[PDB]
Each structure stands twice: as structure tokens, then as C-alpha cells.
Amino acid sequence: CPLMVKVLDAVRGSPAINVAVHVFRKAADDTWEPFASGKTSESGELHGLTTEEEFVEGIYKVEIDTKSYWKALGISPFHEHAEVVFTANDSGPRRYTIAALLSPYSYSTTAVVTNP
Amino acid sequence: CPLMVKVLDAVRGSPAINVAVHVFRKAADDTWEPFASGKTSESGELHGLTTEEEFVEGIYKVEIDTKSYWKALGISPFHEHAEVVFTANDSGPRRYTIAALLSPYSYSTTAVVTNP
Amino acid sequence: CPLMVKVLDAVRGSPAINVAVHVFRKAADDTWEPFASGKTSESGELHGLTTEEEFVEGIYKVEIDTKSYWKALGISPFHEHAEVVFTANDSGPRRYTIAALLSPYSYSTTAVVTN
Amino acid sequence: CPLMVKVLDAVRGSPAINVAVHVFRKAADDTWEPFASGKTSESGELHGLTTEEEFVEGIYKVEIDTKSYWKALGISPFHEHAEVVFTANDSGPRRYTIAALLSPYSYSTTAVVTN
Ligand SMILES: CCOc1ccccc1-c1nc(-c2ccncc2)no1
Ligand SMILES: CCOc1ccccc1-c1nc(-c2ccncc2)no1
């Protein structure tokens, strides 16, 4: 519930299904520790990444594997991935949705942050 | 169910709440006939605009009143509105989501079209 | 020089070349009167639309013929066109650039207003 | 000339001026080595990053320091930075422009790859 990812396809006008997403958290030593991962559903959504307990304050990186998606539709895209890096939960727990809209040579991302 | 509008605020990182939306349909005489209207909810969504019966084939215009939103947050924006114009249901009934992401000097829009 | 339009293609990663663009000014009776038009260049730009003398405060609509663009590339598009509607205000900077980034089911637009 | 970066501000409708940009090339051991950097100009552009000789095929990362930008304007931002990661491929056009459109909780990026 606290971290959700939504991915849309701007070419097809559809959810981007079966998109791999990897989440990292910056460790004390400044390396990126694996935090969670998953694949978007048939609605382009990925829930279930983490729990309120696990999702502590920190700097998080959400890596959306856009290059496998375009190639596994038969398209050679420009970007390797879309990376979204942000500090989370630094004034207490929030719920974050990271949304991404994909084209072969472009993407946009936005965050929706709500306080439960 | 067949036509939904979702509006997000890129400054606040939130749904864009209480955004007025007007939908028009192009008439035989090439004028824009009022079709439906409403306001986004606290989740930035507007459902209930039309029914499968009412939502026939045609050219539709979804006008999102972005200028009242920015001003009624105390911001003077650039655009008068965001207009999304498209042919609908021309190969049979589809479900359309029109999404818009707003900034004072910019917006983006995408469509998600699904076949029930 | 006061009004320029820049159009980009998010599918091919290129300027959107030979796109028709029509500019309208809102008239007293709430109708849209033709103001300027042209086709984007090889760099996706359209210059020469108006002059400082002609470009007075008011409500303008920039209609980009995205459907013809995508059709000419063999790609099925969603929108009839992209329309960007804005007020020109003399209290703000002098030169307006209307930029649009096109995909078949999506577009993005922004204004760069500079002195 | 082969690599340019353009940054725009969607809140103010202007170029994003004096934004720090760092470019990295991926090394054999999967680490990111510094390649080029600078600050955007008054037109939101950064030229002069590299030369044709230096800019070989590979994986590049363009990190835009969006958080400092927004802080200097007094605006609370979401992202630490914006990172654009791509492969340079010689089979495609010669000149790369990486464009980014910034908002406090969102950004858009596109590539314009031309000859
Ligand atoms: C939290 C975002 O959730 C959504 C949920 C349902 C449908 C769409 C979205 C969504 N739309 C956009 C959007 C992307 C590009 N241009 C305009 C809008 N980003 O996310
Ligand atoms: C003001 C002229 O604009 C430009 C001039 C030169 C090159 C590129 C651009 C440009 N990039 C974008 C853009 C839009 C949405 N997401 C990312 C980028 N819009 O315009």
C-alpha cells in the first residue's frame, strides 16, 4: 500500500504490462541496496512491493525496465531504463505512487504522495 | 464506465481535485454540442460522465479547466484549458480514460483505451 | 519572432517535420478567427508566424495537425489534433515558444516565455 | 556538438538556468565513471560536453541536479535528481539532444537524435 508503481504505454494507449521494476534504497555506505522488485500487472500496476514496517525513511531508487518492454514488443528504444530517485518518509509515513508514461524515445514520470 | 478523466498536479504531487471538465461531441453541422460535464473528486477522478448507450461514435472534445484550478490555488497559469479531441467508438464500444498531468506552464495528456 | 512553435516526435526521437500548425485568435463574439499558419521545418520549428505589431494581447489557439502527421508515417493515432489555448499577456516576457512532444496516444506541451 | 542537454521549467515557463548536469559513461566493471559536466546557460542549454572523438558508443547517464535547482527558487522538490540513461549507437543519427522538462513532482525527458 505504501509504494505503488503505475506504467502506461503512449504508443498503444494501454497499460504497460509485464514491465519489470526494481527498487533500491541507499545504504549508510552510499551504495544502492536491493529493496524490492516486481512486474506490472495487466492493468500496468505493481502493488505489494513493501510494507509500512519495511518502508523506512531513506533515499529510494525505482528503476523501471523500459528497454525490455520496447524490445519485447519488437521495438528498439532509446533509454536503458527510467530511474526515479527520491527521499521517502522523512516527515513520517506517506503513500507514494510513482507513475510513468512511456514512448520509445521519451518518458515522463510523476509522483503522487498522500498522507494516510 | 466508458469515459473517465483523471487529473494530477505536478507541483503538489497530488490528485488535482475539484477540476471542472466539459465534454462536447461534434454535431452533423460541425458545431460542438455539450455532451456531459463534471468535477474531479478528491482522488482526481471523474466518473459517471456518460453511459454506454449515450456514448455513441463521434468526435469528442474533453475540455479540462486548468486555468480555474491554478488560480484557485493562487497561481496565474499559462493555458486557458487543456483540450483533448478524439474519435471514439468507431470500431465499436471502448472504454476511455483521459489522463492529464498539470503544471502552471505545461500539461501532458494520455489516453488509455480498452476493449471490454 | 514573438511566437514560435517547436514540435518533437517521441516515437522516432526526432523533430516532427512537415506538421501543419494553425493559429487562431479569439474574436469578440467568442469565435476563433484565423491568425497564422504554416508547416514545421526540418528542425520541427515554425517561425515567421507573426510580427510584434500583429501579436497583441488576447486568447490564442495553436492547433497542431497530429493526426495527419502520424498517418503520413503509417502510424495509427488517437487525437484529431493537439490544441494549445493560452492568453498572451504583455505584463510577462516578450517571446513565446509553444513546444509539443508527440506520441500516438499522448502529447505534452509547454510554454517558454522569455525576454 | 554530438551531445547537448536542454532543460526547461514547467512552473515558470522558462529555460532552467544554472542547473548542474553530470554525464557518466558505464565502465567495464559496471561502475559509472565521470565523463562531462557543466551548468545550463541562460537558454537552459549545455553545449561543449564532449567531442566527436571522445563520444564513443556505450551506455551513458545524464544526471540533472533538479533538487538544487528547485531549492534555489524556494520550491520544495520531490526527486533527488533526474537521471537519463541511454545507449549511444553509431548505426543511428550523429547528434544527441537530451531534453528535460521539470516540475517539482514530475519530469519528462526525450531524445532528439539527428544528422
Ligand atoms: C498516479 C497516476 O495514476 C494514474 C491512474 C490511472 C490512469 C492514469 C494515471 C496516470 N496518468 C498519468 C499521466 C501520464 C501522462 N499524461 C497525463 C497523465 N500518470 O499516471
Ligand atoms: C523551448 C524549445 O523546446 C526545445 C528546444 C530545443 C530542443 C528541445 C526542446 C524541447 N524539449 C521539450 C520537451 C518536452 C517534454 N518533455 C521533455 C522535453 N520541449 O521542447
Burial class (CB in 10 A: 0-12, 13-18, 19+), C16: buried
Residues contacting residue C67 through CB under 8 Å, at least 6 positions apart: C77, C79, C80, C81
Q: Which of D73, A9, A16 lies closest to B104, judged by CA?
A: D73
| Contact criterion met (CB < 8 Å) for C85 and B86 | no
- Substitution target in B95, B109, B112, B113 with the highest count of C β-carbons within 10 Å is B109
Q: What pairs with residue A6 in β-bridges? A: A45, A99
- The answer to whether residues B62 and C82 touch, using CB atoms and an 8 Å cutoff, is no
The parent domain of residue B35 ranges over 1-116
| Polymer length of chain C | 115
Strand, helix or coil for residue C66: helix
Taking the Cβ of residue C42 and every Cβ of chain A, the question of whether any pair is shorter than 8 Å is answered with: no
Q: What angle do CA A79, A84, A85 make, to 5 degrees?
A: 130
- The answer to whether residues C63 and B84 touch, using CB atoms and an 8 Å cutoff, is no
Whole-angstrom distance, CA of residue C95 vs CA of residue C76: 34
Taking the Cβ of residue B11 and every Cβ of chain D, the question of whether any pair is shorter than 8 Å is answered with: yes
**Alpha-carbon torsion, ordered D27, D28, D30, D34, to 10 deg:** -10
Whole-angstrom distance, CA of residue A9 vs CA of residue A66: 10
Q: Which of A72, A96, A68, A94 lies closest to A82, judged by CA?
A: A68
* Set of cell numbers at residue A109: 514520470
Contacts of B109 in chain C (CB under 8 A): 106-108
How big, in percent rounded to 5, are the helix, strand and coil portions of chain C?
5, 55, 40
Q: What is the CB-side half-sphere exposure of residue B110 using CA atoms within 13 A?
A: 23
Burial class (CB in 10 A: 0-12, 13-18, 19+), D4: middle
Say if residue A54 carries a ligand binding annotation.
no
Q: Which of B90, B99, B98, B100 lies closest to B59, judged by CA?
A: B90
Run of H or E residues at A97:
strand A95-103
Run of H or E residues at A69:
helix A66-71
| Contact criterion met (CB < 8 Å) for D105 and A83 | no
Taking the Cβ of residue A104 and every Cβ of chain C, the question of whether any pair is shorter than 8 Å is answered with: yes
Q: What is the CB-side half-sphere exposure of residue B24 using CA atoms within 13 A?
A: 13
Contacts 24+ apart (CB under 8 A), C29-38: C32/C61, C35/C60, C36/C3
What's the Cα-to-Cα distance from D115 to each of C15, C43, C72, D112, rounded to whole Å? 11, 11, 21, 10
To the nearest whole Å, the CA of C99 is away from the closest chain D CA by 11
Place of cell 456518460: B50
Contacts of B101 in chain D (CB under 8 A): 106
CATH assignment at residue C84: 2.60.40.180
DSSP strand pairing (C58-64 vs B58-64): unpaired
Task: Give the count of beta carbons closer than 10 Å to the beta carbon of residue B3.
Answer: 24
Annotated binding site of B for L-thyroxine: 6, 45, 108
Contacts of D108 in chain C (CB under 8 A): 101, 108
Contacts 24+ apart (CB under 8 A), C38-44: C40/C5, C40/C7, C40/C15, C40/C16, C41/C15, C41/C17, C42/C15, C42/C17, C43/C15, C44/C6, C44/C7, C44/C8, C44/C9, C44/C14, C44/C15, C44/C16, C44/C17, C44/C19
* Set of cell numbers at residue A102: 512511456
Domain tally, chain D: 1
What technique determined this structure?
X-ray
Nearest neighbour of C8 by CB, restricted to D10, D14, D112: D112
Whole-angstrom distance, CA of residue C26 vs CA of residue B39: 26
Ligand 1 neighbour A10 (Cβ under 6 A): no
Taking the Cβ of residue A4 and every Cβ of chain B, the question of whether any pair is shorter than 8 Å is answered with: no
Contacts of D10 in chain C (CB under 8 A): 110
DSSP strand pairing (D79-88 vs B20-26): unpaired
Nearest CA in chain A to C9: A105
